[PDB]
Amino acid sequence: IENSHADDVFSPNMVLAKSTRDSAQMIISSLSDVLVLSPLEVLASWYAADLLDALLMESLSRKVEISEIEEIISLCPKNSSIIRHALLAKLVLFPENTADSLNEVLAAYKNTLDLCSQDSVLKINLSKLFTLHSCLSLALQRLGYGDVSKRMYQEIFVPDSDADITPLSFIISWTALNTFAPICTSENDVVEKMAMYVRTAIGTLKI
Amino acid sequence: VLSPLEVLASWYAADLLDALLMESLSRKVEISEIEEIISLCPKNSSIIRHALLAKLVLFPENTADSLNEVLAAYKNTLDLCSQVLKINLSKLFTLHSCLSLALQRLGYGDVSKRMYQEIFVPDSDADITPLSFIISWTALNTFAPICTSPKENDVVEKMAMYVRTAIGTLKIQDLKL
């Protein structure tokens, strides 16, 4: 229970060492939401979280449309945690909207940074590094620079086998493996390592 | 986990490396001096990467072959990092702009400018090392005649105010001695 229970120990936040309490009570990206996010916007961020984790798993069985993502984006809060992941989902799940999408991602990140120094150390784990890593290369293959996007995909550090594996990072790692399964042969280690990442991860209901 | 011999090797290397970066600004620099550095730097340390990022910037025909190692050391520093990252704003910006610089020197232009235009230049704090300065200087140089054209959203202004405060604090930190 992560986005379910873990999302609770965060509802009380209406200062960095404060949140290690969560560990004893039982991911470090949603910790940032305590510095400036209403006690309400915490719970709104929770519902938009669960609403996105459910929307990504339906993107494999059914054909899904942007109207469902913009619902999650407006449902989300101004500058939250899940507002950044929602845009990534948009950048991954819709190639016809990558240029406009890539801007909205890099703007929401150029924004998260400005209101970190002007109010300053980053908190990223390897799984969310690999997540942004792949999501960019996939976004740049779709923009024609694949003469570059291949060589970037070649040097991706892929995590190992563990319980932690949000559906956002799964959908990216899956759709990126597919979009690079043919081009990458000319190194080739990534496709095999990335495909093993997906095969090794499967805690999903038959849909 | 480093012994007591390699800690001094890194301090000695870090001073020579800082010396080579500032010397490269008013003298003609080469790699022959960096080979001596990286070999002097112990085999698995932060100074390795700083010696590499300096080699990436200071040697432009060697971009292709020095970008190889910059990624190798970072994919290797990531390799043992699991078998949680904590990166600084200026560290991000340094890597950010250093890659933008390395890509323009490759022939991406568009991809080089767009990454350059999304650089998040730090405000103006104490995190000013001759390496971060040398990168921002040479990157401002090789990009000021390209990103200055499209007019609307650019960091050219923010980038130049960074190098202002750079040699502001380095020339003044050196003048006290």
What does it look like?
2 copies of one chain form a homodimer. With 207 residues, chain A is an all-alpha fold. The first copy, chain A, has 2 domains: 2-117, no CATH class; 126-200. Helix content of chain A is 60%, strand content 0%. The first copy, chain A, has 10 helices and no strands. Chain A has helices at 2-6, 21-25, 39-61, 66-75, 82-93, 99-117, 126-141, 146-154, 167-180, 189-200. Chain A is globular. The first copy, chain A, starts with a helix and ends in a 7-residue tail after the last helix. In chain A, 31% of the residues are buried. Chain A binds chain B through residues 28, 106, 110, 113-114, 116-118, 120-126, 129, 140, 145, 148, 155, 157, 159-160, and chain B through 71, 75, 78-79, 81-89, 92, 103, 108, 110-111, 118, 120, 122-123, 125. Chain A: It is found in: Endoplasmic reticulum membrane. Chain A: This is Sterol regulatory element-binding protein 1. Chain A: It comes from Schizosaccharomyces pombe (strain 972 / ATCC 24843). Chain A: Forms a tight complex with scp1, composed of 4 copies of scp1 and 4 copies of sre1, which protects sre1 precursor from degradation by the proteasome. The PDB classes it as dna binding protein.
* Structural class category of chain A: mainly alpha
Largest sheet of chain A: none
Apparent shape of chain A: globular
- What is the percent of helical residues of chain A? 55-70%
- Taken together, the total number of domains of chain A comes to 2
Question: Quaternary status of these chains?
Answer: homodimer
Biggest interface and residues each: A-B, 23 and 23 residues
The portion of residues forming beta strands of chain A comes to: under 5%
Distance between the termini of chain A: 21 Å
Our count of helices of chain A gives 10
- What is the succession of H and E elements of chain A? HHHHHHHHHH
> Radius of gyration of chain A, rounded?
17 Å
Organism (chain B): Schizosaccharomyces pombe (strain 972 / ATCC 24843) (Fission yeast)
Protein name (chain B): Sterol regulatory element-binding protein 1
Subunit structure (chain B): Forms a tight complex with scp1, composed of 4 copies of scp1 and 4 copies of sre1, which protects sre1 precursor from degradation by the proteasome.
Subcellular location (chain B): Endoplasmic reticulum membrane
